[PDB]
Each structure stands twice: as structure tokens, then as C-alpha cells.
Structure 1
């Protein structure tokens, strides 16, 4: 007989299987549609989620009852030091799907990306890319033989970049290598871009600007094995229930004589790749300057780092992106910041944002001071001796 009372299903069938991701670095499954007229540019950037802070800004939203008055909004900071371009890959259109034809690498690779190709770096003879580095001997005659191949064929051009993890306060020493589709210009111009940018560093402000809707691609925080009550949000069984109440009472009818795939069942929660969209950038912060955390209405010579460092992460000494709200993943985690796959024009996008005040109090507690000078001003002279 029927359910006797209708309720929506617990969970979403399109995020299945709720298994662990195949890699910690979530992969980009779709790039923005390419417009050949525009200048050749990157479509994604790699960064490490440092943590979250709080801002104050004036709401510019006519019709809203909080129009032209201050709001407090959470933001997420991703440390984005300038990635290094090390290679290029061309993709030929095939009836079996997009397929790579050949790859070209830079003459010299950093040790932090040579570590990536290894499992035991200390034990290795560091032999990686030694013979490929001999292809540049006379005039690099084998290298233009492959770039001409990419220019002739390869209706899609991607570029190999790696993070500068030696600059971020991580404990990894080993870069993350990714492919970013290269949009704009002809196929030759994309390869021209790639050749000019070998062994070079591309900054984050060249890819992203303020008020831009960007997408966040990261593997979420892991939680191990989880029961159905928290993994799927099903109703807890009553207190009188024998042999367990954090369960699902009926996992199927007699017929079909199987448990269906759509029944909420226990297992891994978290460590899933997710692609969240429409995350506005609030500050494309530059790293080679003080007053990272200063606004026009503050003028305090403070950086973006909270008073005592980002919790579990460290300070910030490089470029960063302030993005509104929360993004998938946790602190210290690699994240892909991707340009929007469509042009949004719903007045949430196209709303220029001017920050008034960025919170730099300590996230290690109920921090009530923004700068050390402010703490020394309020508290005064302490017993601590110089």
C-alpha cells in the first residue's frame, strides 16, 4: 500500500556514488566556452584554501530593505601564489571523444614539480626529464617539431601549470600539476602563448578580477564511515527502538527482492569532489605589498592574515583571492578556481563590491583585537619585558 503520508526523498541521487574521490586534486570536467576573438588567457587557477574571515560592505541592491547600508558577510581566502607554466597539450577532436595527440615540456623543471613524478624523492637519482632536457641541445629542433604538430592538429589547447608550493606555508614541498584549457585566439596563438610562457610565472590577477563570478572545484572534507542519519539526513527512530535508532527502518519492500540503489545506506561521508558555482570575488589581493587587509575606509597597515595566523594553515605572503561565502574543501587543500561557464546578469552578479573593513581578529579564539598595536593600545603596558 501507499506511503500514507508524502515526504520528499532524503538526499540527492545525482551526487552518487558517495565514494571517495580518485584524487585529492578535484578535476575540472568543463571549461568555459571559447571565444576566439578575445586575447589568449587562462580559464582556471590553482590555490590552497587558507581559511575564512569576515568583511563589512555597503549593499548596492535597489529594492532590498537593506539597500545602501552595511552588511556583514563571510568570505573564504585562498592563497594563490603565481603558478609556473611548464608545458602544453593539444587535443584532437575524434568521434570517440576528445583525445590528446602530443605534449611538450619546458627545458628546465623546478625540483618542486620534479617531486610530483616521484614516490620516494630522497631515494631517487633525480633522473626525470634528463633526456627530454637534451632535446633542446642544438636549437630545440625536436621541440618545434612537436609544437608545429599541435598547431596543425589539435582543435583544443591546454597548458600544464604547477603551483609554487614552496611559497605557501604548507608541509608538502611537492607541487600540484594540472591542465588548464587556454581560451581565446587561434590554435597557433595558444601555442604561441604557451611557448612564451614556458618557465614563466602567471599571476592570479591576470586571470581573475574583482566582482567576477567564479566556480570552486575541490574535494570536500572527509569524515570516514558515517551512518544514514548524518550521511543522508533521515529521521532518527524513536527512543523505544530496539537494536538501533540511527538507522533507516525499511530498506525496501518484499518485491523487488533486492535493496534498491535509491535507499539511504551507511558508508563514506565526505572526500567527494564538488563543483560549486557563482562565487563572487571580493578582493584580488596582491602579495608584494603591505595593507593586504586594508580598505579605503580603514587605512590600517595590516595584512590579510588574522592576528596570530590562519588556524592550521599559516600566514599569507603571496597573492590571494577573497571569495564570498564558503567553497568546498577544507584548509590546506588544493582548490581549482574556474571562470563562469555562463554570463550571469541577475544583479547579484554585475554588483560592484567595495570592502569597508576586513576582519583580522584571531580565529584561534574569541579574538577581540585586529592588530598588535590595537591590543597594546587597549591593554597598555604589560609585565612582558623587552
Structure 2
């Protein structure tokens, strides 16, 4: 008989199966539509989630009760040192979908990248690309022919880049390698661009700008095997329930005589791939800048690193991206930032953002001071200082 009262189902059947993602680096599954009039450019970039902090700015939203008033907003800082370009892949359209025709690699790969081709680096003889590099000997006609292939046949071109994980505070030495699609220009212009950046770096300021909406693609924080109550949000059963109460009481009718795929069950929670869209960029930070935590209103020379370091992360000595709100993944996780797939023309999307103040107190407790100097002024002299 019909369920006595209606309610929406628990959870979304578009995110099944709730399983452990296949890699720790989430795949970009769609790149922006290519406009071949524009100059050649990366459509995405790699970074590492540092942490979150807090911002003040004035709101420019006519008609809002908070128009021209200060709001405080959470932000996420992604540590984005420059990516090195180390190769090109040409894809060709087929009636079975895109297929990679050939890859060409740079002559010289760093040990950051070479490490990605080994499970036991320390014991290896380190032979990766040793015969390949010798293709570049003579003029290197072998490379020239493979590039000519790409120019002749390819319908889309992607560059292989790697992170410079050495520049981060992370314990890992093995860089992450990823294909990023080149938009803009002809196929020939794209493969030239790629050729003229082999071994060169690409800086986040080339890709992103202040106020641009971007998408964050990352594997979500893991939580291991989870019960139905927290994994799906089902209602806890009454206190009088024999045999436990964090459960679904009825897992099906008698017919179909099968448990249906749509019923909530216990299993893996977290470590899923996710693509969150429309995160506005509030700051593209320079690493060299000693005042990258300062603003026009707050002229205090300071970096974005909060007192104590970002908890479980470290300093931020590199270029960075500051994005409104939160993104998938935990501190230290590789993250792919992607250009918007569409042209948003909301008033929310078009707002030009100017930060009054960036919080930089310690996140390892109830931090009261923005800088060491601020602390020393308020406290005065202590016994250790003497």
C-alpha cells in the first residue's frame, strides 16, 4: 500500500556509486569549448589546497540591504607554483571517440617528473626517457616528424604539465603530471606554443585573473566505511529499537524480491571525485610579494600565511589563488582549477571584488593577533625576551 506520508528520497542518485575514486587526482572530464580566434592558452591549472581563512570586503550589489557595506567571507587558498610543460598529445576524432595519435616529450625531464614513472625510485637505475632523449640528437628530425604528425591530423591538442612539488612544503617528492587542453589558435599554433614551452614554466597569472569564475575538481576527503545514517542522511530509528537504530528499517517490498539499487546502504563515505563550479577568484597572489596578505585598506606588510603556518600545511612561499568559499578535498590534496565551461552573466558573477582585509591570525587556536609585531605591542615585554 502507498507510503502514508510523502517525503523526498535521501540523497542523489546521480552520484552513484559512492566508491573510492580510482586516483587521488580527479580527472577533468570536460574542457571549455575552444574559440580558435583567441590566443593560445591553458584551460586549467594544478595546485595544492593550503587551507581556508577569512576576508572582509565591501559588497557591490545594488538593491541588496548589504549594498556598499562590509561582509565577511570564508575563502580557500590554493598553493599554485608554476607548472612545467613537458609534452604534447595530439588527439584525432573517430566514430568511436577521441584517440591519442602520438605524444611528444621534452628533451629533459626533472627528477620531480621522472619519479612519477617509478614505484621504487631509490632502488632504480633511473632509465626513464634515456633512449628517448637521444631522439633529440642530430637536428632531432624524429621529434620534428612527430610534431608534424600532430599538426596534420589532430583535432585537439593537450600539453602535459607537471607540478613543482619541491616548491611546496609537502613531504612528497614525486610530482603530479596531467594533460591540460590548449584552447585558442589553430592546431599548428597550438603545437608550436607547446614546442616553444618544453621545459619552461607557466605561471598561474597567465591562466587566471581576479574575479573570474572557476571550477574546482578534486577528490573529496575520505571517511572510510560509513553507516546509512551519516552516509545517506536517513532518519535515526527510535530509542526502543532492538538490533540497533542507525539503519533503514525497510530495505524493500516483498516484490521485486531483490534489494533495489535505490535503497540506502552502508559503505565507503568520501574519497569521491567531485567538480564544484562557480568559485569566484578573489586574489591571484604572487610568491615574491612580501605583502601578498596586505590590501589597499590594510597596508600592514604581511604574507597570506597565518601565524603558526597553515595548520597541517606550512607557509605558502609561491604564487597562490584565493577562491571564495570552499572547494572539494582536504589540505595538501592536489586540485585542478578549470576555466568556466559557460559564460555566466549573473550580477553575482560580474561583480568586481576588492578586499579590505585578509585575516592572518593563527588557525591552531583562537588566534588574537594578526602579526608578531601586533602581539609584541599588546603583550609588551615577556620574560623570554629578556
Q: Give the alignment's TM-score, normalised by structure 1.
A: 1.00
2-side partners of 1:364 and 1:238: how far apart?
A: 39
- 1:313-356 Cα shifts (integer Å, max 9, x gaps): 00000000000000000000000000000000111111000000
Partner of 1:305: 305
- 1:247-269 Cα shifts (integer Å, max 9, x gaps): 00000000000000000000000
What is the deviation of 1:385? 3.5
- 1:158-194 Cα shifts (integer Å, max 9, x gaps): 0000000000000001100000010000000000100
What is the deviation of 1:61? 0.4
- 1:16-48 Cα shifts (integer Å, max 9, x gaps): 000000000000000000000000000000000
After TM superposition, where is structure 1 displaced by more than 3 Å over at least 4 residues in a row? none
- 1:95-127 Cα shifts (integer Å, max 9, x gaps): 000110000000000000000000000000000
State the secondary structure of the residue aligned to 1:150: helix
2-side partners of 1:300 and 1:105: how far apart?
A: 45
2-side partners of 1:87 and 1:305: how far apart?
A: 34
2-side partners of 1:21 and 1:138: how far apart?
A: 44
State the secondary structure of the residue aligned to 2:121: coil
What is the deviation of 1:279? 0.3
2-side partners of 1:193 and 1:242: how far apart?
A: 68
1-side partners of 2:54 and 2:111: how far apart?
A: 37
- 1:342-384 Cα shifts (integer Å, max 9, x gaps): 0001111110000000000000000010000000010010111
1-side partners of 2:382 and 2:174: how far apart?
A: 43
State the secondary structure of the residue aligned to 1:73: strand
1-side partners of 2:333 and 2:353: how far apart?
A: 27
What is the deviation of 1:289? 1.5
- 1:182-221 Cα shifts (integer Å, max 9, x gaps): 0000000000100010000000000000000000000000
1-side partners of 2:86 and 2:383: how far apart?
A: 54
What is the deviation of 1:140? 1.1
2-side partners of 1:154 and 1:354: how far apart?
A: 42
1-side partners of 2:157 and 2:92: how far apart?
A: 9
- 1:32-81 Cα shifts (integer Å, max 9, x gaps): 00000000000000000000000000000011100000000000000000
What is the deviation of 1:294? 0.2
Partner of 1:233: 233
1:193 aligns with 2:215: no
What is the deviation of 1:288? 1.1
Gapped runs of 5+ residues in structure 1?
Answer: none
Q: Give the alignment's TM-score, normalised by structure 2.
A: 1.00
Q: Which has the higher helix share?
A: 2
State the secondary structure of the residue aligned to 1:188: helix
